[PDB]
Tab-separated table of C-alpha atoms in Angstrom:
chain	number	residue	atom	x	y	z
A	1	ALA	CA	-13.467	-65.168	-43.131
A	2	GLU	CA	-13.384	-61.687	-41.596
A	3	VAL	CA	-15.869	-58.954	-40.717
A	4	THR	CA	-15.103	-55.241	-40.955
A	5	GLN	CA	-16.879	-52.515	-38.977
A	6	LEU	CA	-16.393	-48.840	-39.837
A	7	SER	CA	-18.152	-45.682	-38.654
A	8	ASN	CA	-18.223	-42.323	-40.440
A	9	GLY	CA	-21.527	-41.191	-38.945
A	10	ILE	CA	-23.165	-44.334	-40.329
A	11	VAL	CA	-22.159	-47.772	-39.043
A	12	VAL	CA	-21.166	-49.967	-42.010
A	13	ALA	CA	-20.457	-53.695	-41.606
A	14	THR	CA	-19.436	-56.202	-44.292
A	15	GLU	CA	-18.545	-59.884	-44.670
A	16	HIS	CA	-16.725	-60.518	-47.942
A	17	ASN	CA	-16.929	-63.860	-49.761
A	18	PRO	CA	-15.278	-63.940	-53.215
A	19	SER	CA	-16.547	-67.477	-53.915
A	20	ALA	CA	-20.247	-66.541	-53.837
A	21	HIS	CA	-22.201	-65.731	-56.994
A	22	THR	CA	-24.601	-63.092	-55.576
A	23	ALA	CA	-24.436	-60.054	-53.293
A	24	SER	CA	-26.825	-58.686	-50.679
A	25	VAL	CA	-27.129	-55.144	-49.273
A	26	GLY	CA	-29.591	-53.758	-46.741
A	27	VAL	CA	-30.313	-51.889	-43.515
A	28	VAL	CA	-31.122	-53.349	-40.075
A	29	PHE	CA	-32.866	-51.326	-37.356
A	30	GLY	CA	-32.520	-51.953	-33.637
A	31	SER	CA	-36.238	-51.955	-32.818
A	32	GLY	CA	-38.600	-54.918	-32.964
A	33	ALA	CA	-41.953	-56.021	-31.599
A	34	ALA	CA	-40.738	-55.362	-28.036
A	35	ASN	CA	-40.684	-51.604	-28.761
A	36	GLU	CA	-44.448	-51.403	-29.375
A	37	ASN	CA	-47.389	-50.958	-26.987
A	38	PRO	CA	-50.658	-53.016	-26.897
A	39	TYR	CA	-52.467	-50.498	-29.154
A	40	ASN	CA	-50.106	-50.342	-32.163
A	41	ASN	CA	-49.103	-54.024	-32.039
A	42	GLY	CA	-48.558	-55.173	-35.615
A	43	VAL	CA	-47.175	-51.901	-36.983
A	44	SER	CA	-43.801	-53.533	-37.766
A	45	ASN	CA	-45.495	-56.391	-39.638
A	46	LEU	CA	-47.379	-53.817	-41.735
A	47	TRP	CA	-44.164	-51.973	-42.644
A	48	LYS	CA	-42.696	-55.244	-43.939
A	49	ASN	CA	-45.597	-55.906	-46.315
A	50	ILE	CA	-45.566	-52.290	-47.518
A	51	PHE	CA	-41.922	-52.788	-48.552
A	52	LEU	CA	-42.789	-56.119	-50.223
A	53	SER	CA	-45.886	-54.787	-52.032
A	54	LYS	CA	-46.498	-55.349	-55.723
A	55	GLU	CA	-45.643	-51.933	-57.193
A	56	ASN	CA	-42.443	-51.725	-55.139
A	57	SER	CA	-41.425	-55.251	-56.163
A	58	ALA	CA	-42.089	-54.487	-59.841
A	59	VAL	CA	-39.703	-51.511	-59.929
A	60	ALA	CA	-36.994	-53.716	-58.407
A	61	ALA	CA	-37.630	-56.622	-60.794
A	62	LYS	CA	-37.055	-54.548	-63.947
A	63	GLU	CA	-33.570	-53.793	-62.594
A	64	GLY	CA	-32.868	-57.398	-61.614
A	65	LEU	CA	-33.298	-57.131	-57.833
A	66	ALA	CA	-35.094	-59.210	-55.204
A	67	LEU	CA	-36.442	-58.056	-51.837
A	68	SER	CA	-36.593	-59.619	-48.365
A	69	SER	CA	-37.723	-58.479	-44.919
A	70	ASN	CA	-37.792	-59.996	-41.428
A	71	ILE	CA	-39.501	-58.970	-38.173
A	72	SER	CA	-38.187	-60.163	-34.801
A	73	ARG	CA	-38.505	-59.112	-31.163
A	74	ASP	CA	-35.355	-56.954	-31.094
A	75	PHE	CA	-34.677	-55.993	-34.727
A	76	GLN	CA	-36.043	-55.690	-38.263
A	77	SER	CA	-34.301	-55.642	-41.646
A	78	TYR	CA	-34.927	-54.615	-45.271
A	79	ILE	CA	-32.655	-56.353	-47.783
A	80	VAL	CA	-31.983	-56.033	-51.546
A	81	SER	CA	-30.156	-58.779	-53.489
A	82	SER	CA	-28.486	-58.700	-56.913
A	83	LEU	CA	-25.677	-60.040	-59.083
A	84	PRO	CA	-22.163	-58.948	-57.963
A	85	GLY	CA	-21.802	-56.406	-60.774
A	86	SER	CA	-24.887	-54.360	-59.844
A	87	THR	CA	-24.573	-53.390	-56.180
A	88	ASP	CA	-24.772	-49.716	-57.186
A	89	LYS	CA	-28.311	-50.190	-58.513
A	90	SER	CA	-29.344	-52.000	-55.324
A	91	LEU	CA	-28.028	-49.176	-53.129
A	92	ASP	CA	-29.905	-46.638	-55.261
A	93	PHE	CA	-33.185	-48.543	-54.804
A	94	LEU	CA	-32.744	-48.492	-51.025
A	95	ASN	CA	-32.263	-44.706	-51.206
A	96	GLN	CA	-35.245	-43.726	-53.378
A	97	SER	CA	-38.004	-46.077	-52.255
A	98	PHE	CA	-37.244	-46.305	-48.530
A	99	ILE	CA	-35.308	-43.217	-47.378
A	100	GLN	CA	-36.387	-40.238	-49.499
A	101	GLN	CA	-39.960	-40.938	-50.618
A	102	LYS	CA	-42.593	-42.798	-48.627
A	103	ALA	CA	-45.745	-41.034	-49.867
A	104	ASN	CA	-45.598	-43.281	-52.941
A	105	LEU	CA	-45.849	-46.425	-50.813
A	106	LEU	CA	-48.333	-44.983	-48.288
A	107	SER	CA	-51.070	-44.068	-50.767
A	108	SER	CA	-54.629	-44.893	-49.735
A	109	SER	CA	-55.146	-47.479	-52.479
A	110	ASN	CA	-51.934	-49.325	-51.567
A	111	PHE	CA	-52.505	-49.189	-47.798
A	112	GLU	CA	-56.007	-50.696	-47.840
A	113	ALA	CA	-54.974	-53.572	-50.112
A	114	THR	CA	-51.944	-54.376	-47.935
A	115	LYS	CA	-53.974	-54.291	-44.698
A	116	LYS	CA	-56.462	-56.782	-46.176
A	117	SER	CA	-53.673	-59.216	-47.079
A	118	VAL	CA	-52.070	-59.050	-43.619
A	119	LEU	CA	-55.374	-59.661	-41.793
A	120	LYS	CA	-55.897	-62.873	-43.770
A	121	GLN	CA	-52.387	-64.133	-42.897
A	122	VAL	CA	-52.881	-63.610	-39.148
A	123	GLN	CA	-56.285	-65.334	-39.274
A	124	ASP	CA	-54.875	-68.419	-41.011
A	125	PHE	CA	-51.972	-68.512	-38.533
A	126	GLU	CA	-54.293	-68.596	-35.507
A	127	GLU	CA	-56.436	-71.416	-36.946
A	128	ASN	CA	-53.942	-73.851	-38.500
A	129	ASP	CA	-50.356	-73.430	-37.199
A	130	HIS	CA	-50.559	-75.155	-33.815
A	131	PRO	CA	-46.855	-75.648	-32.817
A	132	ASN	CA	-45.849	-72.051	-33.559
A	133	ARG	CA	-48.870	-70.430	-31.895
A	134	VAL	CA	-48.347	-72.395	-28.665
A	135	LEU	CA	-44.794	-71.011	-28.536
A	136	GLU	CA	-46.223	-67.522	-29.093
A	137	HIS	CA	-48.602	-68.072	-26.162
A	138	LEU	CA	-45.657	-69.217	-24.018
A	139	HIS	CA	-44.024	-65.795	-24.452
A	140	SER	CA	-47.200	-63.915	-23.533
A	141	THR	CA	-47.761	-65.777	-20.253
A	142	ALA	CA	-44.105	-65.827	-19.108
A	143	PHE	CA	-43.563	-62.085	-19.649
A	144	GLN	CA	-47.086	-60.762	-18.988
A	145	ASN	CA	-47.505	-56.951	-18.659
A	146	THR	CA	-43.992	-56.413	-20.043
A	147	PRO	CA	-42.716	-55.493	-23.557
A	148	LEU	CA	-41.384	-59.014	-24.306
A	149	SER	CA	-44.953	-60.444	-24.414
A	150	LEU	CA	-46.277	-58.850	-27.604
A	151	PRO	CA	-46.553	-61.160	-30.643
A	152	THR	CA	-44.430	-60.318	-33.672
A	153	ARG	CA	-47.346	-60.491	-36.131
A	154	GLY	CA	-49.840	-58.568	-34.005
A	155	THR	CA	-53.373	-59.630	-33.165
A	156	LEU	CA	-56.555	-59.359	-35.218
A	157	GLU	CA	-58.097	-56.946	-32.703
A	158	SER	CA	-55.131	-54.556	-32.703
A	159	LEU	CA	-54.467	-54.634	-36.461
A	160	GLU	CA	-57.868	-53.292	-37.546
A	161	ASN	CA	-57.467	-50.032	-35.596
A	162	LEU	CA	-54.280	-49.081	-37.465
A	163	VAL	CA	-54.297	-46.128	-39.869
A	164	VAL	CA	-51.631	-44.433	-42.004
A	165	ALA	CA	-50.774	-41.932	-39.245
A	166	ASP	CA	-49.828	-44.811	-36.922
A	167	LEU	CA	-47.180	-46.039	-39.380
A	168	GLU	CA	-45.687	-42.565	-39.882
A	169	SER	CA	-45.512	-42.074	-36.112
A	170	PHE	CA	-43.540	-45.311	-35.691
A	171	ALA	CA	-41.135	-44.411	-38.508
A	172	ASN	CA	-40.314	-40.994	-37.029
A	173	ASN	CA	-39.350	-42.581	-33.692
A	174	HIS	CA	-37.372	-45.664	-34.722
A	175	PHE	CA	-36.098	-45.358	-38.315
A	176	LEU	CA	-33.129	-43.238	-37.267
A	177	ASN	CA	-29.423	-43.042	-38.048
A	178	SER	CA	-28.412	-43.897	-34.467
A	179	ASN	CA	-30.592	-47.046	-34.588
A	180	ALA	CA	-29.374	-48.430	-37.929
A	181	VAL	CA	-26.585	-50.539	-39.441
A	182	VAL	CA	-25.890	-50.818	-43.180
A	183	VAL	CA	-24.870	-54.390	-44.019
A	184	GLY	CA	-23.314	-56.122	-47.008
A	185	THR	CA	-22.757	-59.854	-47.538
A	186	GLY	CA	-21.684	-62.201	-50.304
A	187	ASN	CA	-19.417	-61.026	-53.132
A	188	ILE	CA	-18.837	-57.385	-52.186
A	189	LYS	CA	-15.689	-55.679	-50.896
A	190	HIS	CA	-15.749	-53.373	-47.882
A	191	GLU	CA	-14.109	-50.247	-49.301
A	192	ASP	CA	-16.284	-50.384	-52.423
A	193	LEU	CA	-19.381	-50.110	-50.214
A	194	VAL	CA	-18.177	-47.231	-48.023
A	195	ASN	CA	-17.162	-45.164	-51.074
A	196	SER	CA	-20.547	-45.667	-52.738
A	197	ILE	CA	-22.292	-44.372	-49.615
A	198	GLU	CA	-19.808	-41.501	-49.224
A	199	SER	CA	-20.214	-40.520	-52.896
A	200	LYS	CA	-23.639	-39.391	-51.666
A	201	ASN	CA	-24.506	-37.937	-48.244
A	202	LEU	CA	-27.078	-40.384	-46.843
A	203	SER	CA	-28.562	-39.637	-43.407
A	204	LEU	CA	-31.940	-40.830	-42.129
A	205	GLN	CA	-32.693	-38.505	-39.192
A	206	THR	CA	-30.798	-37.036	-36.238
A	207	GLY	CA	-31.835	-37.993	-32.726
A	208	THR	CA	-32.445	-41.007	-30.511
A	209	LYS	CA	-35.374	-43.386	-30.056
A	210	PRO	CA	-37.776	-43.459	-27.075
A	211	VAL	CA	-36.796	-45.295	-23.903
A	212	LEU	CA	-39.276	-47.768	-22.462
A	213	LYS	CA	-39.704	-47.845	-18.703
A	214	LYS	CA	-40.666	-51.432	-17.849
A	215	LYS	CA	-37.875	-54.006	-18.048
A	216	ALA	CA	-38.547	-57.669	-18.824
A	217	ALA	CA	-39.408	-59.972	-15.919
A	218	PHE	CA	-40.214	-63.690	-15.741
A	219	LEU	CA	-43.398	-64.819	-13.981
A	220	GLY	CA	-44.394	-68.410	-13.268
A	221	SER	CA	-47.795	-68.908	-14.914
A	222	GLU	CA	-49.824	-71.028	-17.333
A	223	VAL	CA	-52.382	-70.636	-20.125
A	224	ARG	CA	-54.600	-73.466	-21.433
A	225	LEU	CA	-56.500	-73.390	-24.744
A	226	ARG	CA	-58.465	-76.645	-24.778
A	227	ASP	CA	-59.868	-77.808	-28.144
A	228	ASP	CA	-61.330	-81.325	-28.201
A	229	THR	CA	-61.980	-81.337	-31.973
A	230	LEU	CA	-58.205	-81.311	-32.769
A	231	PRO	CA	-56.430	-84.684	-33.197
A	232	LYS	CA	-53.297	-84.046	-31.067
A	233	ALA	CA	-51.963	-82.197	-28.033
A	234	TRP	CA	-49.248	-79.514	-28.296
A	235	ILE	CA	-47.338	-78.407	-25.165
A	236	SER	CA	-44.461	-75.989	-24.427
A	237	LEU	CA	-42.675	-75.596	-21.078
A	238	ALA	CA	-39.749	-73.394	-20.029
A	239	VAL	CA	-37.832	-71.716	-17.217
A	240	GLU	CA	-36.145	-68.319	-17.261
A	241	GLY	CA	-32.963	-68.506	-19.342
A	242	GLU	CA	-29.987	-66.387	-20.477
A	243	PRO	CA	-29.870	-63.066	-22.350
A	244	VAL	CA	-27.407	-61.952	-24.984
A	245	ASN	CA	-24.059	-60.838	-23.412
A	246	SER	CA	-24.344	-63.433	-20.660
A	247	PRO	CA	-21.287	-65.322	-19.354
A	248	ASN	CA	-23.366	-68.544	-19.341
A	249	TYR	CA	-24.604	-68.119	-22.926
A	250	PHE	CA	-22.801	-71.132	-24.424
A	251	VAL	CA	-23.306	-73.339	-21.347
A	252	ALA	CA	-27.091	-72.997	-21.716
A	253	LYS	CA	-26.945	-73.976	-25.400
A	254	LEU	CA	-24.871	-77.069	-24.577
A	255	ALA	CA	-27.365	-78.161	-21.905
A	256	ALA	CA	-30.189	-78.106	-24.473
A	257	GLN	CA	-28.052	-80.151	-26.902
A	258	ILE	CA	-27.804	-82.954	-24.297
A	259	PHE	CA	-31.521	-83.713	-24.614
A	260	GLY	CA	-31.830	-82.604	-28.251
A	261	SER	CA	-34.560	-83.349	-30.797
A	262	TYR	CA	-36.497	-86.467	-31.760
A	263	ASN	CA	-38.726	-87.831	-34.535
A	264	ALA	CA	-40.489	-91.149	-33.910
A	265	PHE	CA	-40.940	-91.886	-37.633
A	266	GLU	CA	-37.295	-91.452	-38.694
A	267	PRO	CA	-35.291	-94.646	-38.008
A	268	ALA	CA	-31.935	-92.944	-37.350
A	269	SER	CA	-33.557	-90.492	-34.915
A	270	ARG	CA	-34.532	-93.476	-32.730
A	271	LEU	CA	-30.881	-94.550	-32.242
A	272	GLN	CA	-29.477	-91.344	-30.689
A	273	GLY	CA	-27.388	-91.338	-27.520
A	274	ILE	CA	-30.067	-89.742	-25.322
A	275	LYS	CA	-31.104	-91.535	-22.128
A	276	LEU	CA	-34.612	-90.017	-22.224
A	277	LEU	CA	-35.445	-92.124	-25.315
A	278	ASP	CA	-35.533	-95.350	-23.261
A	279	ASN	CA	-38.650	-94.283	-21.335
A	280	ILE	CA	-40.424	-92.699	-24.313
A	281	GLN	CA	-40.179	-95.547	-26.826
A	282	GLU	CA	-41.392	-98.235	-24.407
A	283	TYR	CA	-45.007	-97.017	-24.577
A	284	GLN	CA	-44.695	-94.439	-27.439
A	285	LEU	CA	-45.254	-91.341	-25.338
A	286	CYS	CA	-44.980	-88.715	-28.129
A	287	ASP	CA	-44.422	-88.076	-31.840
A	288	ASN	CA	-41.644	-85.443	-31.663
A	289	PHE	CA	-39.897	-83.061	-29.297
A	290	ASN	CA	-37.159	-80.421	-29.456
A	291	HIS	CA	-35.217	-78.498	-26.803
A	292	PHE	CA	-34.307	-74.823	-27.123
A	293	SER	CA	-32.356	-71.976	-25.536
A	294	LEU	CA	-33.618	-68.570	-26.692
A	295	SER	CA	-31.876	-65.295	-25.861
A	296	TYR	CA	-32.960	-61.669	-26.092
A	297	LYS	CA	-31.534	-58.317	-25.011
A	298	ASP	CA	-32.937	-58.530	-21.471
A	299	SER	CA	-33.984	-62.145	-20.731
A	300	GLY	CA	-34.365	-65.620	-22.229
A	301	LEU	CA	-36.189	-68.950	-22.136
A	302	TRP	CA	-34.879	-72.512	-21.735
A	303	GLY	CA	-37.108	-75.543	-22.296
A	304	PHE	CA	-38.832	-77.861	-24.785
A	305	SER	CA	-41.893	-78.325	-27.020
A	306	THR	CA	-43.671	-81.556	-27.974
A	307	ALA	CA	-46.611	-83.008	-29.931
A	308	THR	CA	-48.520	-86.133	-28.915
A	309	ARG	CA	-51.287	-88.480	-30.077
A	310	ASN	CA	-51.132	-90.550	-26.839
A	311	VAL	CA	-53.536	-88.348	-24.894
A	312	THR	CA	-54.102	-90.658	-21.912
A	313	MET	CA	-50.391	-90.804	-20.946
A	314	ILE	CA	-49.511	-87.094	-21.050
A	315	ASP	CA	-48.592	-87.086	-17.344
A	316	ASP	CA	-45.953	-89.784	-17.903
A	317	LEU	CA	-44.335	-87.725	-20.679
A	318	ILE	CA	-43.907	-84.592	-18.541
A	319	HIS	CA	-42.733	-86.628	-15.538
A	320	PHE	CA	-39.984	-88.511	-17.403
A	321	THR	CA	-38.659	-85.343	-19.077
A	322	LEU	CA	-38.382	-83.383	-15.821
A	323	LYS	CA	-36.626	-86.244	-14.001
A	324	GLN	CA	-33.894	-86.114	-16.655
A	325	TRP	CA	-33.488	-82.361	-16.098
A	326	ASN	CA	-32.761	-83.129	-12.422
A	327	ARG	CA	-29.662	-85.085	-13.479
A	328	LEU	CA	-27.908	-81.925	-14.727
A	329	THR	CA	-27.522	-80.872	-11.078
A	330	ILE	CA	-26.822	-84.322	-9.646
A	331	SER	CA	-25.392	-86.987	-11.942
A	332	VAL	CA	-24.525	-85.801	-15.465
A	333	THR	CA	-21.702	-87.917	-16.907
A	334	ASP	CA	-18.574	-86.962	-18.836
A	335	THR	CA	-19.483	-88.895	-22.003
A	336	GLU	CA	-22.775	-86.982	-22.342
A	337	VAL	CA	-20.894	-83.663	-22.221
A	338	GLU	CA	-18.403	-84.700	-24.927
A	339	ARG	CA	-21.228	-85.797	-27.243
A	340	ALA	CA	-23.018	-82.461	-26.787
A	341	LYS	CA	-19.804	-80.565	-27.605
A	342	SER	CA	-19.460	-82.117	-31.066
A	343	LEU	CA	-23.143	-81.688	-31.926
A	344	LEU	CA	-23.255	-78.041	-30.804
A	345	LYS	CA	-20.253	-77.293	-33.024
A	346	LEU	CA	-21.939	-78.964	-36.004
A	347	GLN	CA	-25.193	-77.062	-35.396
A	348	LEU	CA	-23.496	-73.664	-35.001
A	349	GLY	CA	-21.343	-74.282	-38.066
A	350	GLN	CA	-24.397	-75.011	-40.202
A	351	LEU	CA	-26.199	-71.863	-39.031
A	352	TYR	CA	-23.360	-69.442	-39.809
A	353	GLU	CA	-21.896	-71.121	-42.922
A	354	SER	CA	-24.914	-71.705	-45.118
A	355	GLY	CA	-24.720	-70.503	-48.694
A	356	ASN	CA	-27.435	-67.861	-48.350
A	357	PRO	CA	-26.253	-64.218	-48.120
A	358	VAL	CA	-29.715	-63.120	-46.921
A	359	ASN	CA	-29.326	-65.328	-43.828
A	360	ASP	CA	-25.844	-63.890	-43.265
A	361	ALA	CA	-27.103	-60.301	-43.523
A	362	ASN	CA	-29.687	-60.861	-40.775
A	363	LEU	CA	-27.189	-62.512	-38.418
A	364	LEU	CA	-24.461	-59.902	-38.934
A	365	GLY	CA	-26.648	-56.832	-38.445
A	366	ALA	CA	-28.383	-58.083	-35.301
A	367	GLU	CA	-25.084	-58.815	-33.537
A	368	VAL	CA	-23.353	-55.508	-34.369
A	369	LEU	CA	-26.392	-53.575	-33.072
A	370	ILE	CA	-26.116	-55.102	-29.587
A	371	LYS	CA	-22.407	-55.799	-29.054
A	372	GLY	CA	-20.705	-53.394	-31.465
A	373	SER	CA	-18.726	-56.187	-33.159
A	374	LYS	CA	-19.076	-59.826	-34.210
A	375	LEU	CA	-17.569	-62.906	-32.576
A	376	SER	CA	-15.893	-65.202	-35.090
A	377	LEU	CA	-16.700	-68.897	-35.397
A	378	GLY	CA	-13.127	-69.821	-34.470
A	379	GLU	CA	-13.359	-68.028	-31.133
A	380	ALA	CA	-16.799	-69.495	-30.412
A	381	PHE	CA	-15.407	-73.018	-30.873
A	382	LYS	CA	-12.711	-72.443	-28.236
A	383	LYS	CA	-15.231	-71.337	-25.597
A	384	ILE	CA	-17.291	-74.499	-26.179
A	385	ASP	CA	-14.257	-76.801	-25.833
A	386	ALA	CA	-13.354	-75.370	-22.398
A	387	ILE	CA	-16.673	-76.263	-20.710
A	388	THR	CA	-16.397	-78.923	-17.989
A	389	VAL	CA	-18.913	-81.068	-16.105
A	390	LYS	CA	-18.582	-78.751	-13.086
A	391	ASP	CA	-19.646	-75.801	-15.264
A	392	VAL	CA	-22.844	-77.664	-16.198
A	393	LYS	CA	-23.649	-78.625	-12.589
A	394	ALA	CA	-23.149	-75.053	-11.361
A	395	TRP	CA	-25.380	-73.602	-14.095
A	396	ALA	CA	-28.212	-76.075	-13.494
A	397	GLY	CA	-28.161	-75.585	-9.720
A	398	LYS	CA	-28.944	-71.904	-10.308
A	399	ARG	CA	-31.416	-71.989	-13.223
A	400	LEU	CA	-33.149	-75.398	-13.009
A	401	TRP	CA	-33.205	-76.809	-9.463
A	402	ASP	CA	-36.406	-75.799	-7.585
A	403	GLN	CA	-37.398	-72.958	-9.926
A	404	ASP	CA	-40.650	-71.584	-11.339
A	405	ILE	CA	-41.912	-72.662	-14.771
A	406	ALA	CA	-44.242	-71.418	-17.512
A	407	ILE	CA	-46.627	-73.722	-19.413
A	408	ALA	CA	-48.720	-73.336	-22.577
A	409	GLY	CA	-50.900	-75.873	-24.366
A	410	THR	CA	-53.677	-76.532	-26.894
A	411	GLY	CA	-55.747	-79.421	-28.210
A	412	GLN	CA	-56.675	-82.532	-26.212
A	413	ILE	CA	-54.949	-81.474	-22.999
A	414	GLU	CA	-57.341	-82.958	-20.432
A	415	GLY	CA	-54.640	-85.347	-19.206
A	416	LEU	CA	-52.270	-82.472	-18.425
A	417	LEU	CA	-52.268	-82.117	-14.642
A	418	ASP	CA	-52.375	-78.815	-12.797
A	419	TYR	CA	-49.521	-76.480	-11.904
A	420	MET	CA	-48.365	-77.679	-8.472
A	421	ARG	CA	-48.004	-81.322	-9.534
A	422	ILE	CA	-45.669	-80.207	-12.341
A	423	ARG	CA	-43.867	-77.587	-10.216
A	424	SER	CA	-42.942	-80.193	-7.585
A	425	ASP	CA	-41.105	-82.299	-10.195
A	426	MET	CA	-38.421	-79.589	-10.508
A	427	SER	CA	-36.692	-81.119	-7.470
A	428	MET	CA	-36.054	-84.594	-6.207
A	429	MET	CA	-36.643	-85.213	-2.532
A	430	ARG	CA	-33.607	-87.536	-2.715
A	431	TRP	CA	-30.889	-84.864	-2.821
B	1	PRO	CA	-54.313	-91.801	41.728
B	2	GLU	CA	-53.079	-90.826	38.225
B	3	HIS	CA	-54.591	-87.319	38.576
B	4	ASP	CA	-51.388	-85.281	38.958
B	5	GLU	CA	-49.615	-87.178	36.165
B	6	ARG	CA	-52.578	-87.048	33.748
B	7	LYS	CA	-52.746	-83.248	33.857
B	8	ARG	CA	-49.002	-82.852	33.256
B	9	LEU	CA	-49.056	-85.188	30.239
B	10	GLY	CA	-52.138	-83.432	28.874
B	11	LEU	CA	-50.357	-80.073	28.790
B	12	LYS	CA	-47.612	-81.417	26.513
B	13	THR	CA	-50.154	-83.056	24.189
B	14	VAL	CA	-52.398	-80.003	23.764
B	15	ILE	CA	-49.451	-77.670	23.015
B	16	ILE	CA	-48.030	-80.005	20.344
B	17	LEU	CA	-51.415	-80.662	18.709
B	18	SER	CA	-52.289	-76.942	18.677
B	19	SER	CA	-49.072	-76.104	16.814
B	20	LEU	CA	-49.691	-78.804	14.201
B	21	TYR	CA	-53.227	-77.496	13.650
B	22	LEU	CA	-52.109	-73.898	13.056
B	23	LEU	CA	-49.257	-74.940	10.750
B	24	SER	CA	-51.562	-77.097	8.603
B	25	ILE	CA	-53.862	-74.128	7.935
B	26	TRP	CA	-50.932	-72.077	6.583
B	27	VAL	CA	-49.650	-74.941	4.420
B	28	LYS	CA	-53.103	-75.716	2.978
B	29	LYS	CA	-53.737	-72.072	2.071
B	30	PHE	CA	-50.332	-71.789	0.370
B	31	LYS	CA	-50.794	-74.916	-1.754
B	32	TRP	CA	-54.328	-73.958	-2.882
B	33	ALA	CA	-53.683	-70.368	-4.012
B	34	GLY	CA	-53.172	-71.234	-7.687
B	35	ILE	CA	-56.602	-72.871	-7.930
B	36	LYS	CA	-58.412	-70.148	-5.959
B	37	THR	CA	-57.311	-67.277	-8.252
B	38	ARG	CA	-57.865	-69.076	-11.579
B	39	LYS	CA	-59.751	-67.161	-14.303
B	40	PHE	CA	-61.829	-68.313	-17.300
B	41	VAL	CA	-62.773	-66.592	-20.582
B	42	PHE	CA	-65.281	-67.796	-23.205
B	43	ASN	CA	-65.132	-66.940	-26.907
B	44	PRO	CA	-67.923	-68.622	-28.947
B	45	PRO	CA	-66.540	-70.726	-31.807
B	46	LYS	CA	-67.353	-70.203	-35.464
B	47	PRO	CA	-70.099	-72.463	-36.885
B	48	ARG	CA	-70.030	-74.961	-39.804
B	49	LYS	CA	-67.737	-77.678	-38.444
C-alpha cells in the first residue's frame, strides 16, 4: 500500500492495487458548495447532473465505461471506471466530453430537461428525508452569513433563476489546472498513467480561482421547524469542532467514539459498553442516536443527532446526554479510552480499505488538494495509540466546558425547552 | 433612645439593598435577550393532507 504524487504541470496521484479487478480514473477540483454565493447556489449540483445525463452516459456505455460524480462543501469529482485493460479509453472520454467540448452538453434541449429533474429531487428531499435535512439546517444556523452555510444541493428558490450563462461563468473561474488533481485507483500503475497524459498535452486553463473574503465563524443559535403532523421528533446539536490540519484532529474523533451510535431494535446494540445507555433504556428515551466529528478547511462541528417517538420526555434525553459530556473534563476513566481506541481503528480501517475504487478516488483526491500528500493508515494508527486520558481532559476543557451550542429540530418538538435551559447544562456547578 | 443607632444601621441596609437591586436588573436583562430578539416566519402549507 503506497501512494505516489508527481507534478509536471499537472498534479497526478495514484494508489495501485494489483489484486483489484477494475480501475478508476478521474479529476477532482478544489471548489465545493462553500465557493458559491446565495444567488448561484446549486450550480455545482447542476454540473454533476449534466455530466451524468443520458446522452453522455450512452457514449460511455458503448465503450464499456461507467460514470460517477460527488458534490461536497470543499471539493467535487468526476470519475470514469472501466476494466483494467481499457484505461486509455477512459482517459480519452474525460478529454473529449469534459475538457475540450462543452457546447454538446450545454444545448438548450439538454439543459431544460436536466433542470427539471434536479428540481424534483430537491423537492422530494425537503419533504421526506427528515434526518438529513435537519443536519443541513444545523450547518446554516451555526455558520450564518458565511460561506460554510450554503446547502450542497441548493434551494428551490435559487435553482429556478439559473441559466446556461451561470454555469459557464462558474466553470471559467474554478475548473482550472491549478485547482485540479488527476487521480487513479484500483488496478493501474503510476508510470502508465503519467505517460498516457504526457503522450498528449492536456491543460485546462492558466490562472487562479477567486478568493473569498469572509472566513468561517461559529455562532451560537437555533432554528425550529415544528410540524405536528409528523410521527417523530428529529434533533441535532453541536459545538464548534476541529478543521483539517488540526493537531487535535484524532483526539476529537476518539471523543465521539466514546459515546458512539445506538439502535434500540438491534439486540447487540443494546449491550455496548457505553454508560449513557443505562439512563436511556430505563424509560426508552429514543430510537437511535449517533455522534460525529466533522472537519472542513476552516472549521468543524462536534455533536450528535437523534430520533424519538417519546415526545413527552425530550427534556430528559437532552439532559442525560449533556451530563455525560461533562465527564470528559472531570472523570473519564482509562478503560473507556482503551475501548474507544480499538473501535476508532476498526472504523477508520473499514473506511479506507473497502473494495470500491470509486470511494478510494474521492478520498485520495480530497486529501492531496489540501495537504499536498496523503497520510498512510499505518501512521494514523500510531497517533491514535499515543493518546492518553490527560489529552482527552485537556481537549474537552477547551472545546466543551461552558461553550456555546447550535440546535436544529423538526417534527413534534414542543417538549424541547428553550436555549438557556440547554446552554446551562454545558457546565456542572459542582466543579 | 435608639435614634442614633437606628440611623447608622439604616445606612448600611439601604446601601446593600440598592446594590442588589441594580445588579438584578442587569442579570435579568442578560438572561432574557434570547427571547426578546426571537423572530418568526410563516409559509402556508400545501393542501390535500
